[PDB]
Symmetry: C3
Subunit: 267 residues, 3 copies
């Protein structure tokens, strides 16, 4: 099933399924997990379009520690893989902070090559100070596991969804302080540089169609910030989903797949 | 599940299952797919004999581009693998144009080491002009994908066999122009060099038992050609199957495995 | 299946679970990999974090590795678990993987390795048919006969499906190099120590050790275990009602429970 290519001199794991014409779905996971984040959505995505599920460097089957990297590399690697696989136009689907690389990829290639982007459960406000507090705790060699269990318990929010539970408990092993510390750095730095992902989006040369789908962030006035953003910018849309967890693509695979297909159709 | 060894400086993916006295079944796929082309046959083959499924160079999990190669490397890599495992006598089961490499193996090693060869749906006549056109089309950098989609339509006809449809749609990703173009050159050169696989078989120093099992060229003069070849060559046998597709090992795995097992019994 | 380089060699593993306490660490026999524990894994990973470990040369990459024995098998596994930030752990080890589990326990002490579970390791000196296969599998000119003898001694005319499938279909991909090394290393352990029971008696600081088996289904064999357990309160044993030499595959629920009980103490 799982194939690899060397891109930018590092090993990128992926799989490539489907032959329908049109834009390719490219799945991009969050930090510390791999293309199994999209097992639930995959049957629906691959029926609709060629779907390429992409792993970050250091996240494939080879779990040796890699040279330090962040969002520039995640985007350079994913783009290099797609050129090698002769993927022309494509629609990134990106989980939480993988959204940052998805937007970097959209900015580098333009709206004809990347006509749309879906983001799942990415904090659109500036970084809350509780979050920044945990981003530092996972950079602590003696307490990073503490920070991880803390982030996870709030991601689960006491769900009973077996897909989400199994994925967190069982399907994201083999990472440790190196990768969790790096996630801390890269995320912490992304919010310090841009302020928030919405400000990153407004800095896009020619914004493609962007859709944020989420269930957690809040309740909430988080929503009015989206309405507000969506009213300012025709290319932005969004959809609160009513899941219990930070993992809408796993908790609600058909609905999220439906959203991606709709997003693609529109563009 | 899948293992790799370095043979002739390249990575050869394979898997090895079964423990039974006698010859070993060695599965060989066509161009641009891997050992999952024998997932359906494998239960029946491994119950009968030790079975080694072999990928070509560049077709394993590592999908980095490799240097140019043809039938000679395919044959030498496979032999090198089996020598590394100390497999003694074995029976290649080869899909379509993997059959050229199976005959070259049989020729190199002779009929005690390779007492029999099974080939699955390999055009035994000279290449039809419409096939030659397709082989040239997959060498065109701008239209290779059209050439492929045309071939696939041929191969599926109107099937609703899910094993075959899933194999072609979903289980054969991760290849592009480098490999499809190479298949075109190599298959084209083979028909121009030998005229046809049947002429190739007649050039064998000491022919082993060779069986051709096929569904596709429609019934008619193709079967008469096979009747004539089998009347001239007692070491040759053939079976037309009732399938719709170019993939008898995937569409009719039980029946093709029984044919292999019967071939081996008789040699 | 994931890999890491440890001590210059590729160690394949997988890592599942997050419950606190000691980590389960599975160790397969010669010529097998993690699949030896597919059946117990659902039970183990629900109870504790579980790391299934392959020996060097036994993972997906089947290129030949530097010659090695128990010492390297122990050090590669320790090195992996350190890279995975595993602290205390309870090895579960099939047959002659048990020698490496005992070495790991010896090296690390009874706090980091509070218990070891071994699945069907002949606790007497080896029987003559087995010893003859250990020797034949080392002989360049007859090793395949040695391997067939070894495989026949594993199977013992059983009819259980999971175990037939495991032995027949999950031990491929090895050649003379690794099959001869198994014979060499197993025979060397019996030559060095006499028996696994003598090896355990040599432990600096015996942890709890439980032997789980269905075969050697005699009377003299349970006597041996009774005598040894009378002499040694850290030793326990459970004879299950299976027919095969692979309790973790034949009776995965019952083995996993014995492991979970073992860990509890
Ligand atoms: C992406 C789905 C592809 C499935 C690959 C199966 C390969 C195969 O069966 N045949 C050929 C491949 C290249 C050129 C000619 C042929 C021919 O069989 O005539």
């Amino acid at each position: 099933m799982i194939t690899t290519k060397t891109v930018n001199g590092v090993q990128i794991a992926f799989d490539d399924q489907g032959h329908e014409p049109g834009p390719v779905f490219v799945t991009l996971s969050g930090w510390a997990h791999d293309l199994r984040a999209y097992d639930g959505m995959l049957p629906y995505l691959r029926a609709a379009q060629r779907t390429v599920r992409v792993c970050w460097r250091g996240h494939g089957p080879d779990r040796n520690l890699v040279g330090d990297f962040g969002i520039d590399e995640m985007a350079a690697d994913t783009i290099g893989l797609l050129d090698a696989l002769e993927v022309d136009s494509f629609v990134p689907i990106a989980h939480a902070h993988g959204g940052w690389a998805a937007l970097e990829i959209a900015d580098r290639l333009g709206a004809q090559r990347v006509p749309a982007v879906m983001i799942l459960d990415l904090i659109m406000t500036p970084a809350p100070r509780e979050f920044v507090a945990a981003l530092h705790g996972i950079q602590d060699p003696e307490r990073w596991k503490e920070g991880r269990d803390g982030l996870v318990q709030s991601w689960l929010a006491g769900t009973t969804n077996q897909a989400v539970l199994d994925h967190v408990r069982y399907d994201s092993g083999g990472h440790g302080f190196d990768m969790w510390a790096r996630a801390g750095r890269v995320i912490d730095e992304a919010y310090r540089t841009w302020g928030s992902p919405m400000r990153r989006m407004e800095a896009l040369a020619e914004p493609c169609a962007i859709r944020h789908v989420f269930s957690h962030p809040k309740i909430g006035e988080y929503d009015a910030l989206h309405d507000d953003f969506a009213a300012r910018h025709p290319w932005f849309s969004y959809r609160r989903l009513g899941g219990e967890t930070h993992f809408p693509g796993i908790e609600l695979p058909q609905q999220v797949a439906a959203e991606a297909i709709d997003l693609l159709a529109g563009a």
